[PDB]
Amino acid sequence: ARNKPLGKKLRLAAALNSNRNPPLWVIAKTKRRVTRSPARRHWRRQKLKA
Amino acid sequence: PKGVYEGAGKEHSCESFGVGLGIARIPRYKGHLWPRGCFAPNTRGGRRAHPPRPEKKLHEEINWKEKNLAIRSAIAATAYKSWVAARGHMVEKVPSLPLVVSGDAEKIAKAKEAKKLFEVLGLWPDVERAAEGVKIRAGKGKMRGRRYKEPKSVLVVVSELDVPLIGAVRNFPGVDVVPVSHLNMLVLAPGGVPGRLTLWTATAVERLKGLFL
Amino acid sequence: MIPKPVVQVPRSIKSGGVTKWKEGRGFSLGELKEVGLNAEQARLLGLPVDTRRDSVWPQNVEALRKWLIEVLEGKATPPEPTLPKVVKVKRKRGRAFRGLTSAGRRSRGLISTRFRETHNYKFKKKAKERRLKKRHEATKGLGNVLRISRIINES
Amino acid sequence: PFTASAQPRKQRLSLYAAPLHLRRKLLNAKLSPELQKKLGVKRLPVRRGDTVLIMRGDFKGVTGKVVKVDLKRVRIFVEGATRTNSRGQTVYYPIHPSKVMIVDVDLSDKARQKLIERRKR
Amino acid sequence: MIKRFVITEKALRLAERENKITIIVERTATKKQIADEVQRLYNVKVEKVNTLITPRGEKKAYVKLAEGYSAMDLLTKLGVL
Amino acid sequence: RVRLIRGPFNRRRPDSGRRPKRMGVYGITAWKSWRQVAEERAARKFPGLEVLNSYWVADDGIYRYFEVILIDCNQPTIQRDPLYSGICGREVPRRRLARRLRERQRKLIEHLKKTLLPKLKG
RNA sequence: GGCAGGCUUAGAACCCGGGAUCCCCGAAUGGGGCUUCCUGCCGGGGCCGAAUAGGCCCCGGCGCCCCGUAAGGGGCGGGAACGCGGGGAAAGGAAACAUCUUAGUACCCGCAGGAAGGGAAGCCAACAGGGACCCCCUGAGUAGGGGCGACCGAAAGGGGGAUAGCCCAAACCAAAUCCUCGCGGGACAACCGUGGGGAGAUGUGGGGCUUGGGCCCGGGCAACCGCCGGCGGGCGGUAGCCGAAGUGGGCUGGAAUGCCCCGCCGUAGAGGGUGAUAGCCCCGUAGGCGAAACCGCCCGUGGCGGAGUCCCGGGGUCCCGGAGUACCUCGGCUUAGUUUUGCCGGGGGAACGCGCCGGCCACUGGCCGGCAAGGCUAAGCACGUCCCGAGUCCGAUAGCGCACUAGUA
RNA sequence: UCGUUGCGGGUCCGCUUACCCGCCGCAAGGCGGGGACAGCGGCAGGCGGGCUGUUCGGCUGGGGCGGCACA
Ligand SMILES: [Mg+2]
Ligand SMILES: [Mg+2]
Ligand SMILES: [Mg+2]
Ligand SMILES: [Mg+2]
Ligand SMILES: [Mg+2]
Ligand SMILES: [Mg+2]
Ligand SMILES: [Mg+2]
Ligand SMILES: [Mg+2]
Ligand SMILES: [Mg+2]
Ligand SMILES: [Mg+2]
Ligand SMILES: [Mg+2]
Ligand SMILES: [Mg+2]
Ligand SMILES: [Mg+2]
Ligand SMILES: [Mg+2]
Ligand SMILES: [Mg+2]
Ligand SMILES: [Mg+2]
Ligand SMILES: [Mg+2]
Ligand SMILES: [Mg+2]
Ligand SMILES: [Mg+2]
Ligand SMILES: [Mg+2]
Ligand SMILES: [Mg+2]
Ligand SMILES: [Mg+2]
Ligand SMILES: [Mg+2]
Ligand SMILES: [Mg+2]
Ligand SMILES: [Mg+2]
Ligand SMILES: [Mg+2]
Ligand SMILES: [Mg+2]
């Protein structure tokens, strides 16, 4: 939406911050055990109920 | 008493969707996992059909007079070299059965002193048998605290509780030490077979005349 | 050793005159006055006193006299007194809401009958037996199975 | 402080999940007979700078200084018990402390001496 | 109050051309508080403060210094440049 | 003072299927009496005060009147009351009761030796 | 299990005890809240500003219903299960089904505690006696209820766990009373002195509690009954510490804990790790020691108060002894309760200790047992969020839905 | 029909304070009307598919109608 409430906007900021895979050194640190994050999503596939 | 969780396999939201969908009519998931079967014994994640029940009666009761008659019978089996050799014990060095020692043996307080008396009485070879017979048992008992299987060597009967001979012999592999008033079938016939290599003290034999009869 | 009072089991009509004895609740006041003590002194010494009991038994008196001599001759240690040694009364919240006032007690039936015969007791007791599968509740219809089986076998 | 339960699952659970102050007791090693007579204590946890003798494995018989101790892994690095990787650098073999004998003690730490009196006494 | 400075390409162009320093402050800091913090901390004069809340949830303030003070000088004095 | 409407409670007719025994309305009453109901309503208006007792006062064509005695258990003059400490709580240390009872037993045994022992032995 | 840079011998990491910080929403409590955010009044402070204007910002207070003279204090929400009160089904069973059962259950509303509730004879009995209560075994599927069908179903008594008895009101005296605060004293307390305020004759306080009491008289202390928890000591919990005996010779081996040979400890051969299978390599085990701080329990001593309220003897025939209660009738729910359980509602409605209540339909007489309609009460009993131990339990499609960045995606 | 239900007078008449209905007033209270009726609670009879639960047998040249070959 063009016009947002700040409470809804802040929750979108939290989702935006967490949407990222684990860094490449974490994969090396864990010997390829930690490769994926559950907070990873696509905007078109998984919809936040914000 | 062993059992399963009372609600295991039964707390999923499932229901049978009838016929007409071309699928079997077992219960299935209601939500996004809809075709997946649930709750039945033949389904993955389903309930165990007839699991063990904690209220099951595992104890086999025995009458008191019957149980005491068996204890006298198992005591008499220790008097014969045939039964003790049949149960597995080495009795070639044993001077005679039933093996009775003097009541001065109750003052032995050290394991090293007790080990001499076993050697002097021809008992050490059977204790030595249990030492080298210890084996890492096959199966899942290793996971559950039953890694080792240790044979039985010698039952030592003392007159009364808390004599120093109990703490001096209890560390030997396979050796049991009980007062004569605490005799029972778990020490007199291991495996359910009669005839146990027993070292009686002389005072315990005198006290045996008023027990288990 | 503290002596224990010996009282008569109440002889019922069903018994037909067969009688036995039992450990009573406590020594009667009549039995205590034959040894010189009242209820306060007896409870201070540690004896169990039952002021409700009226009967007197000589065996009870002798056991009191033998034990009292040992205590007063310093040959025996008396137990702690048979009186309340702690006072713990908790604050009560929502007495009206849990039916603990006089009106709630009357509605529950505690004024007119015993706790065991009140209806809320009967509901709770039968529920505990069914939950645990206790004595008669382990089988439903046990009386009717027994009755029909008695006919078929004792025909 | 290490489970007293006899079940293997509880024994293994306490060892793996033991905090750092408890894993120090897994670094204990036997002192040499000379050091036993020199100190009067039969064990001391291995410390960096202690000289040890490897007693089992491929490097049994090698003596060297302890270059590194790891509380998390409970391993020690000793000079001589090394090798070279494919790229040529020299790397250390992790030795369990129970496979070594302390033939020389690093006693420059004042806290170590107080632990010496505790075990001889 | 101030969290850090913005030294991006847009922020650097603003400093040289419009005498503006870009900062990240607490999300609850107002324009009155930001102007007071900048003047107190650095001993300059603020003309106006333009503030926005970024899509990542932070507050960014474009502080325009008054016309006697150099925005780039304060950046290079702080050592954050 | 509490005023409430008399009669049986407002039993509700069920709106779903029931067997015929369970469909009646008239004559069915609650197991609570109006006195306990009046106590509970008075307890709500004075939150935190404990209810002691209540009694009937008057009846009219529509209403019944009760008088509920509530006590503040946080007031100092209520806590030490011999009766009000049964609702507001009471504690005595075990050392207080045990020490005096022990002291009483020591002195009673001393007196009984000199005054009751000769009679018992004789 | 990475890359750096640091911290740490001035004693870190780690564990235990005590503190600090602790955003927004949340019982949320200044007011709103269609966005976990916004916004008001008062008081104090700060900033922009020429300004004490005006504005903007920070900080504190501002919920409802109550108790209290005020000061001040309380309740509110949560917790896996258990506990107490109320409302309250159906499916199914009866081989149909309505009474009935299911079941006072599921579920809902309300209210507490670490347990709750119950508890101290208007009892049970049967002319012989028990002696508050709860919980366990039994009595017992007996009595009894019931389309006398299905089915439902006690109690007394006996054996145990544990054991404990008291108060309010009244008779009689009549303000001798209690709460609060100031000051002085007093183990930081209670309490004592003094003064102000509040409650109180619509009765504070004393006394009384079935071994009824009040009232009158005489004798005795082993009087009795309450309040505080200071000082000392002991013990236990919340971190830990000490703890015996091979890393001996040879073989196989990448590596020995394995094999052959030779030793040793054992109050310790429970169990785990270590490069394969270890009593003696290490952790531990038998066994023993331990806390600055916090907590809990026990013992000794210490400090106060009261109207003799305590015990024994006699006298008494005067006084007190709990109401919409007991009881009757009608409707209904419930109960084994049956012409006889309990209760709620409508209507009616006592007596007083010379009285009243119970003894399986009612009444009459006898006899027996008791004193309702006021309050409290440890112990012994339910539960499992949580902690410890055990296991003829399962072993990654099993076992909890979850052995894993699972109530996650 | 029992209670609410009272006060005077000779079952009937009257009265107002109960109760009820409206107006005014924040409330306090006042004004008007009805009136021991009404309304309300309990009990009792009637009408009551408005709503709740159920039953609508069997044999059978398939079921049904018929018949009873159902005693
Ligand atoms: Mg889409
Ligand atoms: Mg499963
Ligand atoms: Mg079997
Ligand atoms: Mg296999
Ligand atoms: Mg039954
Ligand atoms: Mg804007
Ligand atoms: Mg039905
Ligand atoms: Mg708010
Ligand atoms: Mg069922
Ligand atoms: Mg049926
Ligand atoms: Mg049906
Ligand atoms: Mg609550
Ligand atoms: Mg309790
Ligand atoms: Mg209680
Ligand atoms: Mg029932
Ligand atoms: Mg008074
Ligand atoms: Mg050790
Ligand atoms: Mg060792
Ligand atoms: Mg009475
Ligand atoms: Mg597999
Ligand atoms: Mg699984
Ligand atoms: Mg009328
Ligand atoms: Mg009517
Ligand atoms: Mg119909
Ligand atoms: Mg029919
Ligand atoms: Mg047919
Ligand atoms: Mg036909």
Curated annotation (Swiss-Prot), chain A:
Kindly indicate whether the keyword Ribosomal protein belongs to this entry: yes
Provide the alphabetized UniProt keywords.
Ribonucleoprotein, Ribosomal protein
Give the protein family: Belongs to the eukaryotic ribosomal protein eL39 family.
UniProt-listed NCBIfam families: PRK01242.1
UniProt keyword Ribosomal protein, yes or no? yes
Region feature (Disordered):
31-50
- Molecular function GO terms recorded: structural constituent of ribosome
Q: Which GO terms describe its cellular component?
A: ribonucleoprotein complex; ribosome
**Which superkingdom, per the lineage?**
Archaea
InterPro entries per the UniProt record, alphabetical: Ribosomal_eL39, Ribosomal_eL39_CS, Ribosomal_eL39_dom_sf
Q: Give GO BP annotations, semicolon-separated.
A: translation
Specify the protein name. Answer: Large ribosomal subunit protein eL39
Against Pfam families, the record matches this protein to: Ribosomal_L39
Question: Where is the secretion signal located?
Answer: none
**Coiled coil location:** none
Swiss-Prot record, chain D:
Keyword check for Glycoprotein: no
Q: Name one GO cellular component term.
A: large ribosomal subunit
Q: Which GO terms describe its biological process?
A: translation
GO function terms (MF aspect)? rRNA binding; structural constituent of ribosome
Q: Name one Pfam family in it.
A: Ribosomal_L26
Alphabetically ordered keywords of this record = Ribonucleoprotein, Ribosomal protein, RNA-binding, rRNA-binding
Spell out the InterPro entries in the cross-references: KOW, Rib_uL2_dom2, Ribosomal_uL24_CS, Ribosomal_uL24_euk/arc, Ribosomal_uL24_KOW, Translation_prot_SH3-like_sf
Transcription regulation recorded as keyword: no
Q: Which family does it belong to?
A: Belongs to the universal ribosomal protein uL24 family.
Quaternary structure (record):
Part of the 50S ribosomal subunit.
Q: Which PANTHER family match?
A: 60S RIBOSOMAL PROTEIN L26 FAMILY MEMBER
What function does this protein fulfil?
Answer: One of two assembly initiator proteins, it binds directly to the 5'-end of the 23S rRNA, where it nucleates assembly of the 50S subunit. Located at the polypeptide exit tunnel on the outside of the subunit.
Name of this protein: Large ribosomal subunit protein uL24
* The organism of origin for this protein: Pyrobaculum calidifontis (strain DSM 21063 / JCM 11548 / VA1)
